[PDB]
Amino acid sequence: LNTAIATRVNGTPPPEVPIADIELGSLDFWALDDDVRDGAFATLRREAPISFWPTIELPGFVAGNGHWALTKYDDVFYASRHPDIFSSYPNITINDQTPELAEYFGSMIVLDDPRHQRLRSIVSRAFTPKVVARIEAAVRDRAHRLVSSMIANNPDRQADLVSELAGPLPLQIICDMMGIPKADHQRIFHWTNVILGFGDPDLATDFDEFMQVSADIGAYATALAEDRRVNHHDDLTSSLVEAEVDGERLSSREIASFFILLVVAGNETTRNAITHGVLALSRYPEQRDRWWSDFDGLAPTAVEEIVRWASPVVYMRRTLTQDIELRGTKMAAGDKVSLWYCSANRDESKFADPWTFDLARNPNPHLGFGGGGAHFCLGANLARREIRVAFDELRRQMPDVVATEEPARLLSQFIHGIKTLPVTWS
Ligand code: HEM
Ligand SMILES: [Mg+2]
Ligand SMILES: [Mg+2]
């Protein structure tokens, strides 16, 4: 495969970046390549581990007040485990929501306990390890077919990993858990792609399109919920419409926001873990070889290292409910605080060799699924299984699959997205 991308020397730290060249509040910065971004967070960890940044202006989104950026692992961990101080209300991105966004985006992820946990308990059983293990057959059937179709669909042995595997595998699994008919899965995926791609001109930059997509997926959720209210199915949509929280059924807004949260999170995270993982295997072939020659033994550590390496969710935001000082920086009640998982996951204070992609890494206390605590990723067991099966099917059917171009990278501060990744195999 002479068209494979260049390999890299594992363990090489990126050069640190002069602090004057770092603008977290500019979309231009998020367009820099990932070596520069990684070197910039390295500078912040060293020189300004907590620092303040203006919010990025996005068309039709309210920027509002700026935010305190926590770039060190210990601070991101602390903030995550202290939700009475670091609240998830009113929003978990840096920007402000509005009443009009709240119709569609006012889910449990932007609420504190106890209401957060009462909402989460409606669906939590479906995401537990023992229940998710039950659907291995479904994950395998879909992954196996997708990889086979990459082969059958491309006589030239060239494919886009994202559209042909990494995207459609998690999409199928979450949509089927929700109870969405197959004929509408791609419609769901287009809506979630726009919702968490906004600001990249390849996805959407007109706020009117963002609002029409949001209204359209909400109307879809409401219509499916209405069907399930009358005729139950064994799906999460039926669980949502049947549940009672504080003795009251969920409202239309609550059902639509819950539905949207689950399909967005399901569709716009694992795909990037998978795609960054194939990119990493392409750059570090010794790691591919060692996983391929002991797939079951290394899989638990390998999947977690892929998540640490990719950090598919770049950050989450909190809002202080009281004044607090951290690292000698006083922050005030009401201030926004951003938790940079991408940076925690390269912190030398926690990982001695953070720049080494090591599929055997153990322990691996990465914060790719967050810092732990009340909002710890509901889908973590699901995502780990999706990743493990995707790589197993690639190993079994096309073991030498390799990237042939550098990825087209999503322009986003929030999601470490890959839009396309050309691959080949022999
Ligand atoms: C590798 C893929 C994934 C990554 C990196 C990831 C990461 C995260 C992160 C960082 C959070 C915030 C945690 C916190 O605030 O402490 C989160 C929350 C969440 N994720 Fe995941 N996620 C992944 C896959 C999924 C999947 C497949 C689903 C399925 C629907 C999902 C559903 C959720 C939900 C519902 C929440 C909100 C939980 C709550 O507020 O209690 N995620 N995820
Ligand atoms: Mg093609
Ligand atoms: Mg079904």
Side-chain angles (χ1 to χ4, degrees), residues 179 224-233 235 237-238 241-242:
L224 196 68
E226 277 284 292
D227 292 341
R228 295 302 180 263
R229 283 191 182 90
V230 178
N231 291 289
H232 167 92
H233 291 201
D235 59 28
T237 299
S238 296
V241 303
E242 289 165 14

Side-chain angles (χ1 to χ4, degrees), residues 95-129 131-349 351-419:
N95 287 271
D96 298 341
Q97 286 194 38
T98 60
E100 179 53 82
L101 287 165
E103 208 186 315
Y104 306 118
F105 299 116
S107 74
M108 71 187 183
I109 203 174
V110 295
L111 295 175
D112 292 333
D113 286 340
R115 185 158 185 77
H116 159 266
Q117 189 50 237
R118 298 167 180 160
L119 289 165
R120 183 162 168 149
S121 288
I122 298 171
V123 302
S124 59
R125 179 63 69 196
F127 291 90
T128 58
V131 175
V132 172
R134 259 135 204 164
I135 70 173
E136 172 75 357
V139 184
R140 288 277 170 181
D141 198 81
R142 183 56 171 148
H144 188 132
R145 287 174 180 276
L146 286 165
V147 177
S148 291
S149 286
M150 290 176 58
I151 295 169
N153 288 341
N154 300 291
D156 68 356
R157 303 175 293 104
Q158 316 302 314
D160 167 30
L161 193 83
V162 178
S163 64
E164 299 183 62
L165 178 60
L169 168 66
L171 173 67
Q172 178 94 40
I173 306 303
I174 192 62
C175 287
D176 285 342
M177 289 174 64
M178 297 300 298
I180 302 168
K182 172 69 178 187
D184 295 321
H185 293 186
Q186 285 299 318
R187 292 175 66 205
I188 293 284
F189 201 46
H190 168 73
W191 290 331
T192 65
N193 282 186
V194 167
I195 287 167
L196 279 193
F198 193 73
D200 184 324
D202 284 333
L203 281 298
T205 54
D206 188 334
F207 189 71
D208 285 340
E209 179 182 1
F210 181 92
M211 288 310 304
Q212 193 62 67
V213 161
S214 299
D216 287 354
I217 191 172
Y220 186 96
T222 298
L224 196 68
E226 277 284 292
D227 292 341
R228 295 302 180 263
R229 283 191 182 90
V230 178
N231 291 289
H232 167 92
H233 291 201
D234 287 332
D235 59 28
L236 294 176
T237 299
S238 296
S239 292
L240 290 174
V241 303
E242 289 165 14
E244 281 182 318
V245 175
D246 276 10
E248 291 194 87
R249 298 289 185 99
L250 299 186
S251 67
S252 296
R253 283 174 187 176
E254 284 170 329
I255 293 287
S257 290
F258 211 146
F259 179 105
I260 291 167
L261 167 61
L262 292 170
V263 294
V264 167
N267 289 350
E268 304 301 331
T269 55
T270 309
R271 64 179 182 106
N272 296 314
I274 293 170
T275 305
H276 280 283
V278 170
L279 181 60
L281 293 189
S282 298
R283 291 179 172 172
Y284 310 113
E286 300 284 275
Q287 298 303 307
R288 176 207 302 269
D289 290 353
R290 77 193 301 212
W291 195 7
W292 277 195
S293 61
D294 178 17
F295 186 87
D296 295 349
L298 285 182
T301 54
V303 169
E304 298 307 315
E305 182 73 334
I306 288 168
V307 177
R308 183 190 72 91
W309 195 249
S311 295
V313 177
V314 176
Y315 82 89
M316 285 273 177
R317 164 273 184 104
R318 300 287 191 261
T319 308
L320 288 169
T321 66
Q322 61 194 238
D323 302 337
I324 190 162
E325 189 177 327
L326 273 183
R327 265 177 226 275
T329 296
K330 292 197 292 191
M331 298 174 278
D335 288 354
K336 303 177 181 178
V337 181
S338 52
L339 280 52
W340 297 87
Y341 308 125
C342 65
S343 183
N345 282 347
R346 294 298 187 280
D347 193 341
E348 285 189 352
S349 287
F351 302 95
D353 54 342
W355 311 110
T356 296
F357 178 67
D358 176 0
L359 292 184
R361 178 177 295 276
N362 172 243
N364 188 356
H366 76 81
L367 310 188
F369 293 119
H375 296 265
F376 183 81
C377 175
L378 179 65
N381 307 120
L382 180 61
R384 291 171 184 131
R385 187 166 297 275
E386 290 172 332
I387 296 162
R388 180 174 174 158
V389 173
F391 280 88
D392 200 6
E393 294 301 322
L394 288 171
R395 173 194 67 82
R396 208 281 306 172
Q397 305 191 36
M398 50 169 65
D400 58 1
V401 59
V402 67
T404 65
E405 299 186 19
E406 300 295 326
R409 296 175 296 124
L410 185 66
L411 185 56
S412 177
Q413 183 181 43
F414 182 52
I415 295 294
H416 195 202
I418 290 172
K419 287 177 299 197

